Design a protein around this ligand. Structure first.
Ligand SMILES: CC(=O)N[C@H]1CN[C@H](CO)[C@@H](O)[C@@H]1O
Length: 333
């Protein structure tokens, strides 16, 4: 009667026999890679193909926006930070070139999508979105992110928005602490949420933050049916998938058990649960999804990469023009 899925995580260069046996479960619908899973480009290509040899229906994602955190390093251009593009005069063109460049480079390795860009605003308040946020003005960041997403769509990758409904004002970090944002209801509509409302029709995937808004819903935004159903789906006209954020870090312990985390996330309206950095918590969630007999949402296949990317992306006119256009701003490698 309900729908949902699970995105796993491996902690090795190649697949362990245990990883193969947990993949085959239908409730698993994705895999996130980190620094510990990456050696060289060809290594990641055979790692993907090794997973596709088990489940060609899975979708593989990477944490690659090119700033403080860029997982794919050797063999990949040093993408700039989103704040490094704001000062430049033609930011609307550098965004399209930056989005297309990184999306083609990661799709040619084998991954489907990349959790990028971030739609948060740089209020100089949050320690996690330092250089990740585009700019401070809401409309400036909404136009820049729309151009960045425009480049990814031209590359064939579905874009994911982070982090709904806003994480730049939350002074506390959600990786170790529990962020709380006591801003009023109507102010968020005029400030942090503006980029999310502008790109709701141009976006295919969202990631709610784990910040608490006591004005809106005592539970975090990822676990709030008022945030995900009443405001996002019912008001912001959004219709794509809703990727849960990492359900293993701190800030998500408001509900309790690892299994109870994905219970509250799927009951809130999200389409997929994200648990990484811990295999045991992923097994408890998997066993949970097997119990209520989750069905893979028909919206998830929209996020699989349609990329025409081969090893050919090195020889295309967009490749040379975007290289020169981004090299002029002293951003790329
Ligand atoms: C708030 C935040 O930045 N969360 C990150 C947690 N880890 C995920 C998997 O790498 C990322 O997608 C989120 O950005």
């Amino acid at each position: 009667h309900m729908q949902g899925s699970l995105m796993l995580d491996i902690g090795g260069t190649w697949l362990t026999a245990e990883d193969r046996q947990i993949l085959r479960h239908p409730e698993v619908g994705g895999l996130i890679i980190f620094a510990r899973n990456i050696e060289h480009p060809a290594q990641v290509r055979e790692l993907c193909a090794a997973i596709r040899a088990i489940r060609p229906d899975l979708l593989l994602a990477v944490d690659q926006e090119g700033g403080r955190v860029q997982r794919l390093r050797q063999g990949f251009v040093r993408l700039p930070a989103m704040r490094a593009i704001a000062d430049n005069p033609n930011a609307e063109e550098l965004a399209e070139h930056c989005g297309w460049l990184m999306a083609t480079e990661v799709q040619a390795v084998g991954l489907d999508l990349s959790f990028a860009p971030v739609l948060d605003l740089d209020h100089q308040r949050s320690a996690v979105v330092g250089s990740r946020a585009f700019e401070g003005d809401p409309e400036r960041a909404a136009l820049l992110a729309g151009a960045f997403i425009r480049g990814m769509h031209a590359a064939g990758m579905a874009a994911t928005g982070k982090h709904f409904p806003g994480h730049g004002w939350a002074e506390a970090d959600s990786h170790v602490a529990i962020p709380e944002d006591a801003r009023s209801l109507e102010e968020i509509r005029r400030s942090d949420l503006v980029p999310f409302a502008r790109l709701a029709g141009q976006l295919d995937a969202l990631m709610p933050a784990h910040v608490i808004y006591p004005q809106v819903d005592p539970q975090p935004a990822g676990f709030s049916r008022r945030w995900l159903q009443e405001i996002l789906r019912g008001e912001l006209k959004f219709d794509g998938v809703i990727f849960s954020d990492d359900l293993s870090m701190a800030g998500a312990h408001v509900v309790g058990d690892a299994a109870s985390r994905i219970e509250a996330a799927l009951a809130a309206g999200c389409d997929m649960g994200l648990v990484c950095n811990d295999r045991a918590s992923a097994e408890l969630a998997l066993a949970a999804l097997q119990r209520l007999k989750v069905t893979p949402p028909s919206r998830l296949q929209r996020m699989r990469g349609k990329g025409y990317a081969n090893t050919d992306y090195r020889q295309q006119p967009r490749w040379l023009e975007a290289l020169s256009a981004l090299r002029a701003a002293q951003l790329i490698d």
